[PDB]
């Protein structure tokens, strides 16, 4: 038995940060060796008990995620930061115990004309608590006149779209992110390593 790592790392759909999928890898063995023997991950920041030597570690729950973020903002995923994506769309806990694996996908998720099919929220008037999915296509108003079901004066749609083009350098380029978060619960350990 092998964990479905390939599905989470070699899929093609993924989703924007405003409504991000979550996968519960459990009751399987994950070959972590291939994670750090590929020379293809731009960032491999593990904050867990052991960024290397994940052998002899067994847990009762593995949480996998998948995000698409603009290049320069990838570093905002880590805990203790503050910014648009980090505070309004995804926030790690102070005692996070997993890994953040971010790679470049500029050769798959960008079109010459422009792929305006990626979104991120811009405001919530409430700082997000520990990571919690937030899907809401609201028409939040800004006073003045009522927003009668249309994005009119002082009416601001809360889902900005990324400016993805295959011309910008590292800064404004797509990155695919995986917040591979561990969670040791009271239940018996299931996901034992190699």
């Amino acid at each position: 038995n092998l964990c479905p790592f390939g599905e989470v790392f070699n899929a093609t759909r993924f989703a924007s940060v405003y409504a991000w999928n979550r996968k519960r890898i459990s009751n399987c063995v994950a070959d972590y060796s291939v994670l750090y023997n590929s020379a293809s991950f731009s960032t491999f920041k593990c904050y867990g008990v052991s960024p290397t030597k994940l052998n002899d570690l067994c847990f009762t729950n593995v949480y996998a995620d998948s995000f698409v973020i603009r290049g320069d903002e990838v570093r905002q995923i880590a805990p203790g930061q503050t910014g648009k994506i980090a505070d309004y769309n995804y926030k790690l806990p102070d005692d996070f115990t997993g890994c953040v694996i971010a790679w470049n996908s500029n050769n798959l998720d960008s079109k010459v004309g422009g792929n305006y099919n990626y979104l991120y929220r811009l405001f919530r008037k409430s700082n997000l608590k520990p990571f919690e999915r937030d899907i809401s296509t609201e028409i939040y108003q800004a006073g003045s006149t009522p927003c009668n079901g249309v994005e009119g004066f002082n009416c601001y749609f809360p889902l900005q779209s990324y400016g993805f083009q295959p011309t910008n350098g590292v800064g404004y380029q797509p990155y695919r992110v995986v917040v591979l978060s561990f969670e040791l619960l009271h239940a018996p350990a299931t996901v034992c390593g190699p």
């Epitope: 006073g143 003045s144 994005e151 009119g152 004066f153 400016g163």
Partner: antibody, heavy 120, light 112 residues
Framework: EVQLVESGGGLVQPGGSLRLSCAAS????????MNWVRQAPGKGLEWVSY????????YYADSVKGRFTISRDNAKNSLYLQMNSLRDEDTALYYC??????????????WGQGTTVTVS | DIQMTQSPDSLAVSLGERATINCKSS????????????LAWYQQKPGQPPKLLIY???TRESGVPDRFSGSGSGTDFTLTISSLQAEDVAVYYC?????????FGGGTKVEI
Amino acid sequence: EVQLVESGGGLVQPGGSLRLSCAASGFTFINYKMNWVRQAPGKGLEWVSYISSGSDAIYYADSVKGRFTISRDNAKNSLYLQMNSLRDEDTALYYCARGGGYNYGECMDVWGQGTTVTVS
Amino acid sequence: DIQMTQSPDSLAVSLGERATINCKSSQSVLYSSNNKNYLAWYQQKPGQPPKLLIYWASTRESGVPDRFSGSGSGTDFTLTISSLQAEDVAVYYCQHYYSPPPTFGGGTKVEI
């Protein structure tokens, strides 16, 4: 970098039909609000148009209703102002401008070099 | 129907030092549950298009030095430039966007 450019305008007979084009890129028109603003030589500055992302809001001004319209193509990433039944009080330096998003307000931050229109 | 008035029509302030602009609106611009004012201040040199100075009536727009500062109550607004440099003379504009029909008050030509 991100800059706004304009095309069209010039000379026309009284009551003609004009199509002024404002084009730009680098900041994803899909998620910004654009406007047209008048600049009449040696009179002042005014506001005569409004649009939104999906063309939901078409707010006009006082001397606009029934004679101006605003449209925009996001595929080609530009907007067009169609201008019918002109009068000499319409002649001016027309400016295309952008919104601000949640930050700033509905204000104007990036302004194109503008165009000129006059009946004669 | 927001008829706007401004006092310094083509202001000329001692050829230097500071400069003061006063801008008032008939209907109050603030909002009940905002405590913020929806009026903005614009710069415009002759020729080139107008540029941002103040948004939300109290904040210095990023991209300009800290000389300029616009303040005022919920209905009255004033400028403070302090030092009148040799590359700042240009017309100043008010924008009133509390209502669906924003209107631009008028031009004040700050020069010499």
